[PDB]
Design a protein around this nucleic acid. Structure first.
Ligand SMILES: Cc1c(N2C[C@@H]3CCCN[C@@H]3C2)c(F)cc2c(=O)c(C(=O)O)cn(C3CC3)c12
Ligand SMILES: Cc1c(N2C[C@@H]3CCCN[C@@H]3C2)c(F)cc2c(=O)c(C(=O)O)cn(C3CC3)c12
Ligand SMILES: [Mg+2]
Ligand SMILES: [Mg+2]
Ligand SMILES: [Mg+2]
Ligand SMILES: [Mg+2]
Lengths: 245, 487, 487, 247
DNA sequence: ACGTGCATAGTCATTCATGA
DNA sequence: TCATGAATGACTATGCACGT
């Protein structure tokens, strides 16, 4: 068991549960989204750490400079574990570390920067399945009489729309389908019922298979060598759609 | 170089500041209960079409529209004003429908302008109802390119409903919010008893307006302060939150606070208790835990020691925290461009006066327009009776000016009417189409007679205000939130 | 809970980022030389009517319109983008007419959004010329509410004219600005010699485009770098400011810097010299004084010691300061959704291809509309020829549908034409108006013939681009600013 | 008497002049960062310095002295003027013999003027007595004639006059662009500020004079003091007749 | 001394590639 | 290490009146 704040980051909205095994840390993109998350969360088991701006690339940046970064300090301090050789999973203050970023591209970028921080400084968190990715909604179908439905893809939107219309439900062609362009546009209720309510949230657990293969990929994509990254993109971007086929 | 004395400069400049702040910034107009920024935001959104019959527009567009046309000030503070009008814990009856993160009753600030969308609420649509029918005076904006409303129609007593708080120069206002249904009853009485004096009117209105109705619910303790506010324009109203004592399986007791008085910050409230316990000022308290959520609302659990009495701790909370706190009522509003402290009967009466003004002006506008339509229709009917001649005339005319001048002489018609004949489509020459023109004339003349009848009868005018308001209250009126108890 | 491998996640997410940044953020489209934000800001202002034919709108309204409809990002950075397009020292040919404080070439920041107004410039109006005539593909915006243009008509070679600098992922662009008149000559040649191969075209275009023409004037030293950039797509162009040595009546000599190379901060430049003096790095310098003003422009006076040679100090300045600095050209632009480094002949050709596409599409649109109006006019003429019959028919109809159906039967007419006859006003039955309908038909049929001729002849199409561009250059073209000298 | 100007121990916001002679030097105390920025550009850097003031100035009449001295904006003014305050005031160390207060023509500019004048009268009174304090009058309108040079107007009356005269003279204006109305200094560019408020050959300055010190003292205490009632009654009494002070 | 609400924005730190 | 330029806003301090 570990004490919660009521010596940790000022931005941290800690949980109430004294058990890390039961606790969860939502690492959120932006103050707005973090603000709403703080309200919609279950304050018992869920803590919120909003991250502001693009996270520093620990692959590129010198070690001392990374440690001066306010956002990195917040993460390291909140997780409780050390870094590199001084890492101690026993001090992990949350056994669930949910990264929650916008569905947009800059959210994807922030995810890679955070995953880079974790893989380089605190790898065991990934190896032991403590790192997760929340999948935000993209659409909210607002039926005239029925309860609203959330969609996490264009296909699901089309499906739920088709099903509802077939079922005799109806939507306004004005209000209609609200499209989320980021977490910051959501209120507390919406975030709870889509990304934080454990009975409906869509989390993806980050697994680490080949450590050596992961290592080189991180170094290529996140490293200082531009040529390697340039050629890698021109080589593999052509086939990014077909990774899961 | 011109010389100027410091006394002249100081006096002139500061008075100019004080007066505009008083009349044109910090204090509400008695008729619609709005400050300039509120009025300008709402009209900007209205004119932009940001209405409930359409999806939320990005709030930045409302701020920008307000800035560019009506309110020559910063975008930031304008956004703050728009945000507050959308917060259910700030306004008893929100005028802005906000979509996104608009903050919380605690220290959680609202999201930035970029992240939020906003539109007018249905009630705000009643604030602006028929504003385009010359129901209110318009003046040129800050650079004269466009017109802005001096006051809104305000088809429900918004000043008393939503209240107002403002710091000016030399004075300040602090009007609490009220229950719309209770205000309506007061208005209904004022309309029926239009000849009643101030003494009678105050007695009647005070009976129906039982007291302020805060959006944060809570409690009102006592009746003197409420009475003082309504009779004097100043009074101290004691507010309380709601506390419910809970027992535990062990047999430990805990206090559960689910409501707080108006304008009490939840986080500051929790922090205040926390600081008052570590110092040693609220003994008997064992633990403070905020079990609040978006689903259960406010829920502050105060576990007390075994050697502690629940009411003793509660009374200590009333004494040393804002769990019990007073609302300093000061019924100050701008009346005819002058700041004035008003009795409750004066507030109701001035609003009713405004409504009657709105209805009479609306009727006048509709009557004028009705006559214009009738005027042109009479011209068309004359053309139809001599249609063979009219067409032959236009055809044989070398120009349209010759045709128009001829039509005037042919049918003994005005130039406006003659122009309408020219503007007539070949569609309207069909049998059934000729008939609609006739019937439309008959239709309008009935409408004109009705409108004339309204203007000639103060009884109908009052009836319209009553019925139209009654319709609004039936649709948008809600239950009382703040409970009133005795000492 | 679904499992995902870190390599899968990392690769997909980062590639998605690199690609969006490359194609849809940091790098310009080759056809109009615009990034998405630029295109969206300009079109937002255009659609809002913020044009040179009206007074400057508050810039907040442009930001809000861009933000709310097209660009789903923050208000701050959008304002920065709008501001930059209004700075004469940033853009060789500004696309935004700014009113107020938009900053300076030094560290003086632009005023906040609240203080500034903005509208499109006449040249930016050429970027958007006839965009409403289906000259470019439109797509749904970020929420499908409205349509936005994929590319602008760009009736002058904006990419080469204003240049572009952008940092993407895995690559970056740095295209310098050029003199519009020189670019036009290159385009004129490309149009005349439309069959010329790449070798000839590159030789021709390089002869006419003598080199970059920076808004900050200055000097270009040498010709190798310019040649490399045009032939390779990569090149290092040596820039210099302008220095004028002045001699005192009976004192010391001083260096007067009146121009600096492109994108050199004036304040940083002065600071760099000042800091390199006290550190014993630029001896011979006695005193540094900034005599610059809004009326004389840049004027940095560097008084040198008596035992110092002016030319020595200037070379020291060239060496250790940005008085001499290189422009790292990298001619990178998006071509058909793909990032590509281009030769100068490729940049011109791709632009000429775009212009021809615009003109052909414009002609097609105008031809379709011309046919539609002619189609209706043919109906009107039939009505006029049998005018007596037309009226009698409409009269006897119970509805307008019976009247229309009859008109089809009477004159052998479409439903569209008969409807147009029905919508016809009695206005047009006057003599001159009947004649005007006749002549209008004759005019359109003549215009249709012209339009058909254009589509069938590539010669005319190229001619249109030439003549229309020539008109633009004559009006909006200016002298060269950057002087080109030899080693 | 000469003093060094800052060039790469004075306020960071201060854009000092080049002339080392206070007798020829001028300090423009400007309302806002925007206006100060344009002023810094449009000024004559030889004799004119710019000190932008951000936000409403602290009321030295209400706030205690220790709090006033901690205020960044007051410190900037005191430090820039070079002179001390109260008993340690030494006019010999005055870094500018012209202290021009330049605020928006709007109401909040008037308020800032009174706050600044309150600071000066209470901390550095001799600056007022010796006529070192001035008030710049910003333009309100800019008439943009189609062919002729643009004209600036400092009042509604002057706007009407210049409009009438120009039209009578055969000049013409667009009814769209037309007459630009200034709502603050921040809306002006460098050139506009120079040609209306900073160019000594066209600027309209008002020199603050101090006649009755005792009467000034009481007025300052009433308007700016902690006593609200006194201020309230003064306003309700004299606001009715503010228009007729110069009739 | 703190809350209230309408008024009067610059500063702060990263990604990313390239050349000094 | 710095500049470039579109991307990812909270914090900071006064006026003003009034009540705890
Ligand atoms: C967060 C942010 C900044 N901060 C992020 C850093 C980490 C935490 C401590 N604050 C520093 C500085 C900043 F310096 C500038 C901007 C902007 O200029 C800006 C803009 O819109 O231009 C937007 N943001 C926020 C969305 C991320 C900005
Ligand atoms: C200056 C300013 C603030 N501070 C006051 C101080 C002035 C001197 C040193 N800088 C600090 C910063 C502030 F805390 C908030 C705002 C606003 O909220 C705001 C707004 O628009 O809401 C506008 N300004 C500036 C125009 C004055 C603000
Ligand atoms: Mg986003
Ligand atoms: Mg603010
Ligand atoms: Mg920024
Ligand atoms: Mg102002």
């Amino acid at each position: 068991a570990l004490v919660r704040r009521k010596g940790l980051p000022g931005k941290l909205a800690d949980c109430r549960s004294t058990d890390p095994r039961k606790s969860e840390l939502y690492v959120v993109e932006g103050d707005s989204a973090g603000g709403s998350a703080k309200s919609g969360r279950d304050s018992m088991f869920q803590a919120i750490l909003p991250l502001r701006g693009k996270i520093i690339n620990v692959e590129k940046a010198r070690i001392d400079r990374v440690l001066k970064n306010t956002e990195v300090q917040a993460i390291i301090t909140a997780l409780g574990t050390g870094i590199h050789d001084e890492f101690d999973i026993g001090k992990l203050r949350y056994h669930k570390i949910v990264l929650m970023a916008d569905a947009d591209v800059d959210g994807q970028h922030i995810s890679t920067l955070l995953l880079t921080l974790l893989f380089r400084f605190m790898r065991p968190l990934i190896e032991n399945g403590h790192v997760f990715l929340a999948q935000p909604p993209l659409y909210k179908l607002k039926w005239q009489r029925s309860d609203p439905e959330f969609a996490y893809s264009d296909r699901e939107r089309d499906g739920l729309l088709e099903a509802g219309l077939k079922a005799g439900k109806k939507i306004n062609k004005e209000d209609g389908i609200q499209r989320y362009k980021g977490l910051g546009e959501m209120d507390a209720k919406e975030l709870w019922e889509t990304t934080m309510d454990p009975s409906v949230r869509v989390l993806r657990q980050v697994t680490l298979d080949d450590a050596a293969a992961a290592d080189e990929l991180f170094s290529i994509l996140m490293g200082e060598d531009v040529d390697a990254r340039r050629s890698f993109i021109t080589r593999n971007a052509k086939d990014v759609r077909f990774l899961d086929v | 170089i011109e010389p100027v004395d410091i006394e002249q400069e100081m006096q002139r400049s500061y008075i100019d500041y004080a007066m505009s702040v008083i009349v044109g910034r910090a204090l509400p107009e008695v008729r619609d209960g709005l400050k300039p920024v509120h009025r300008r935001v709402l009209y900007a959104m209205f004119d932009s079409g940001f209405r409930p019959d359409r999806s939320h527009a990005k709030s930045a567009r409302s701020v920008a529209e307000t800035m560019g046309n009506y309110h020559p000030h910063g975008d930031a503070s304008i956004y703050d004003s728009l945000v507050r009008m959308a917060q259910p814990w700030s306004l008893r009856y929100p005028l802005v429908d906000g979509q996104g993160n608009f903050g919380s009753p605690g220290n959680d600030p609202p999201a930035a302008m970029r992240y939020t969308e906003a539109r007018l609420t249905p009630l705000a649509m009643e604030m602006l109802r028929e504003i385009d029918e010359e129901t209110v005076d318009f003046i040129p904006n800050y650079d004269g390119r466009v017109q802005e409303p001096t006051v809104l129609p305000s088809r429900f007593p918004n000043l008393l409903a939503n209240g107002s708080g403002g710091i000016a120069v030399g004075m300040a206002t602090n009007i609490p919010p009220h229950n719309l249904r209770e205000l309506a009853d007061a208005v209904f009485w004022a309309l029926e008893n239009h000849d009643a004096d101030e003494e009678e009117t105050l007695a009647a209105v005070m009976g129906r307006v039982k007291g302020p109705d805060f959006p944060t619910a809570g409690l009102i303790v006592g009746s003197q302060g409420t009475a003082d506010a309504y009779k004097t324009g100043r009074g101290s109203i004691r507010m309380r939150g709601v506390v419910e004592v809970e027992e535990d399986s062990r047999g430990r007791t805990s206090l559960v606070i689910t409501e707080l008085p108006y304008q009490v910050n939840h986080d500051n409230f929790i922090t205040s208790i926390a600081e008052q316990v570590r110092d040693g000022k609220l003994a008997g308290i064992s633990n403070i835990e905020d079990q609040s959520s978006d689903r259960v609302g406010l829920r502050i659990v105060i576990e007390i020691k075994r050697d502690a009495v629940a009411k003793v701790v509660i009374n200590n909370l009333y004494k040393h925290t804002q769990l019990q706190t007073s609302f300093g009522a000061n019924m100050l509003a701008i009346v005819d461009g002058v700041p004035r402290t008003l009795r409750l009967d004066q507030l109701i009466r001035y609003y009713v006066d405004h409504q009657l003004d709105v209805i009479v002006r609306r009727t006048t506008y509709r009557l004028r327009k009705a006559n214009e339509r009738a005027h042109i229709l009479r011209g068309l009917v004359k053309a139809l009776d001599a249609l063979d001649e009219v067409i032959a005339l236009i055809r044989a005319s070398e120009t349209v000016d010759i045709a128009r001048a001829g039509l005037i002489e042919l049918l003994d018609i005005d130039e406006i009417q003659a122009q309408a004949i020219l503007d007539m489509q070949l569609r309207r020459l069909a049998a059934l189409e000729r008939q609609r023109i006739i019937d439309d004339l008959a239709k309008i003349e009935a409408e004109i007679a009705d409108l004339e009848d309204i203007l000639a009868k103060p009884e109908r005018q009052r009836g319209i205000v009553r019925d139209e308001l009654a319709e609004i209250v039936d649709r948008h009126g809600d239950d009382r939130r703040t409970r009133i108890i005795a000492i």
